[PDB]
């Protein structure tokens, strides 16, 4: 996907105000709650039967922080998404067997978390930029699937 200079700037400026630990846990947890079929990759995380069980699960939080730490690295190089995520793309396909569609579901959940988190600061232009980024990361991550 192509990001214009304004879009890239909108994305990183705001990301600088983000607490990756907290947001990572919110996003991954709300993913498992809103789209239940995603729990299939995390049966070993423990109890995920309820929203409160999912949200308070320490493994969910630890994992959210990890996926977002990698997401964060990709944001630092918006012009090289494919290359940055090439190895993880192979991993998710060959080792993890994760359907790329899950990358897109997490993307939209992330945008909702940022909106909830930032309130009026998450303006339409800022959201539009995040939607491009989120679609770009999902594409980069699904790029090595065969």
């Amino acid at each position: 996907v192509h990001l214009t200079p304004v879009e890239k700037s909108a994305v990183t400026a705001l990301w600088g105000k983000v607490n990756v630990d907290e947001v990572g846990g919110e996003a991954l947890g709300r993913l498992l709650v809103v789209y239940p079929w995603t729990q299939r990759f995390f049966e070993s995380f423990g109890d995920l039967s309820t929203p409160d069980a999912v949200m308070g699960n320490p493994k969910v939080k630890a994992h959210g922080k990890k996926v977002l730490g990698a997401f964060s690295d990709g944001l630092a190089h918006l012009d090289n998404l494919k290359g940055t995520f090439a190895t993880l793309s192979e991993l998710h396909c060959d080792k993890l067997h994760v359907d790329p569609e899950n990358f897109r579901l997490l993307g939209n959940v992330l945008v909702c978390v940022l909106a909830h988190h930032f309130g009026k600061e998450f303006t339409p232009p800022v959201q539009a930029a995040y939607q491009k980024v989120v679609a770009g990361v999902a594409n980069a991550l699904a790029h090595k699937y065969h």
Partner: protein, 141 residues
């Protein structure tokens, strides 16, 4: 399917939306037109500039339709009858676009409801919006 917990979650959140129905609907449309430019192909006759009174007016109508849906969450198909036919045979909006508006409605709600936009309410709202869209695209063919 919408469970009793879903129904109370949607009712409570929309109750909070209240008199902001119209403005949230207008905001959702602007976020949609900006984030997913292709949706604009359905409004070639609209003044789609920033702050358009036409987008605002439409936002109110879309808002009112949803308030009505919440009020008839038990039998939406019979409450959204005229609108389903409208979109299916007059407007002919490709089904893929309903997901886009729903996403933008959720973001607008998240941005305005810090206290009530909990993971569970978030799940109920998403389920609700998918059902409304299912009712609206039920007569396409």
């Amino acid at each position: 399917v919408l469970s009793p917990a879903d129904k109370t979650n949607v009712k409570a959140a929309w109750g909070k939306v209240g008199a902001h129905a119209g403005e949230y609907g207008a905001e959702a449309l602007e976020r949609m037109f900006l984030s997913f430019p292709t949706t604009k192909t359905y409004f070639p006759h609209f003044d789609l500039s920033h702050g358009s009174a036409q987008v605002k007016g439409h936002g109110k109508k879309v808002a009112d339709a949803l308030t009505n849906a919440v009020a008839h969450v038990d039998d939406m198909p019979n409450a959204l009858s005229a609108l389903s036919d409208l979109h299916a045979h007059k407007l002919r909006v490709d089904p893929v676009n309903f997901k886009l508006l729903s996403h933008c409605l959720l973001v607008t709600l998240a941005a305005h409801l810090p206290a009530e936009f909990t993971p569970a309410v978030h799940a109920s709202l998403d389920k609700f919006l998918a059902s409304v869209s299912t009712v609206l695209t039920s007569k396409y063919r």
